[PDB]
Design a protein around this nucleic acid. Structure first.
Ligand code: NA
Ligand code: NA
Ligand code: ZN
Ligand code: ZN
Ligand code: ZN
Ligand code: ZN
Lengths: 162, 162
DNA sequence: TTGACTCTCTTAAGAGAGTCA
DNA sequence: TTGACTCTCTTAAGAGAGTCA
């Protein structure tokens, strides 16, 4: 809600509830042929999810609290960042999963960045493979690699140059 | 429907028309601190665009040819790939700008790959900075770099471990 | 047969808000 | 007040199809 105290109370309640989500260990590629281990705090697959939580889409949830007799609601991963600017360079700030695990609500696996920065982590080589993200990746992006391109650049005639 | 020869004729007419688009020389990052040059064949900003071409969205165009009284229409960047498989790994193939310049229709600046592979090139370090795309990038992706993350992973209490 | 417009849709990273009990 | 559902929207890489003369 409006007050900094009220916002801290929301973050604290959220952390306590998410802290009771099941902790699932995931071993992950780091880049450079190395492997690491992440501990994701995963929201349940079906109701009940936890106090304050409800599912609004297949992999979307919201956190809600009643403050001043009014319901306040947020995207379930946005709560850690309620005291941060909600935009950057004129782009909306989004909750970004460093663990690439949507059900995970561990705030140690989340950052707050533009949607472009968020998306780009999918292809990052990882913290041991050349990640240059200033807020470092926790793992190599799941889509990193050579790709599966069907056809490359080509022309039939002689009208084009690179 | 259209025979191999007829498809080849569509590709040839498309190349003839695109080859007459304004050719714009762009200096671009290659990765590794090096700069290179790309020559983009840019569709005009407003009508007329060229024989067979029409705008269906702010940066979307289509190519149309009428063969034996039947109107055929394709996305304007898909024409170079009409003789290629249109899916791979159960994913639709998309025209992917190696030059990251949507108005460009140079077929030497296009490849044909899944939408995920396509998007991922936005963050590639480039052909001189570590690109691992099997069909190599022509330049460093425009979104490569440290990012502009507003807030990193953090907790207020001690409920979580990474 | 052609040009110049019109409309909505896909994907996978993300969102806000209303209906009931 | 709290829970469990429902709906549509945003973005930026991409698409197909209709109308009129
Ligand atoms: Na993400
Ligand atoms: Na692209
Ligand atoms: Zn996680
Ligand atoms: Zn990274
Ligand atoms: Zn180009
Ligand atoms: Zn590349």
């Amino acid at each position: 809600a409006l007050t900094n105290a009220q916002i801290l109370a929301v973050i604290d309640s959220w952390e306590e509830t998410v802290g009771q989500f099941p902790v699932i260990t995931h071993h992950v590629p780091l880049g450079g042929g190395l492997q690491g281990t992440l501990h994701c705090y995963e929201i349940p697959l079906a109701a009940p999810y936890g106090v304050g939580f409800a599912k609004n889409g297949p992999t979307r949830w919201q956190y809600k609290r009643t403050i001043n007799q009014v319901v306040h609601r947020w995207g379930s991963h946005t709560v850690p960042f309620l005291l941060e600017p909600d935009n950057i360079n004129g782009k909306t700030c989004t909750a970004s999963h460093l663990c690439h695990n949507t059900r995970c609500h561990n705030p140690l696996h989340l950052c707050w960045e533009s949607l472009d920065d968020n998306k780009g982590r999918n292809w990052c080589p990882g913290p041991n493979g050349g990640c240059v993200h200033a807020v470092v990746c926790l793992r190599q992006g799941p889509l990193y690699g050579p790709g599966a391109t069907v056809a490359g650049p080509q022309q039939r005639g002689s009208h084009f140059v690179v």
